[PDB]
Amino acid sequence: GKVKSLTISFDCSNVPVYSSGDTVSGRVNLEVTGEIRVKSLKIHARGHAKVRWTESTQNYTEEVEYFNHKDILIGHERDGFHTIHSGRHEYAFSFELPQTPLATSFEGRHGSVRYWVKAELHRPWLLPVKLKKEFTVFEHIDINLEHHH
Known about the structure:
Blueprint: E1 2-10, E2 17-18, E3 23-33, E4 36-38, E5 40-55, E6 58-75, E7 82-84, E8 87-96, E9 106-107, E10 111-122, E11 129-134, E12 136-137
Parallel strand pairs: 2-12
Antiparallel strand pairs: 1-3, 3-8, 4-7, 5-6, 5-10, 9-10, 10-11
Protein name: Arrestin domain-containing protein 3
Subunit structure: Interacts (via PPxY motifs) with NEDD4 (via WW domains). Interacts with ADRB2. Interacts with ADRB3. Interacts with HGS (via PPxY motifs). Does not bind TXN (thioredoxin). Interacts with ITCH. Interacts with WWP1 (via WW domains).
Family: Belongs to the arrestin family.
């Protein structure tokens, strides 16, 4: 069998922008011909900030992780032998972002803030296939409140 395509998509028009408290939902999309044996399909979602600065002249950098979510969508972490059959497969995933403040996605001279989901397809006697896809976070969008009578 052969993996013909492996992609990540985010469920939503515009591309979804996320913020504190939001659920990020998406899928790992896999197209296969024939059959393939897999150990696991894993996802790893992460948000982090990295910054750079100079001091009289020794250069420094600092990193902070905002969250780190891991999930096994197929198989088992041990290194299961699940079989993916001919056709198209969309493996759903979802996770919730922290409710506390999250820095806006950013790339600049002095540093960056990045959020992403990484998918890993692990197969017997083969190197993992790894794919990353960024998603955009805004610190401030629209705070939804509810009122009751």
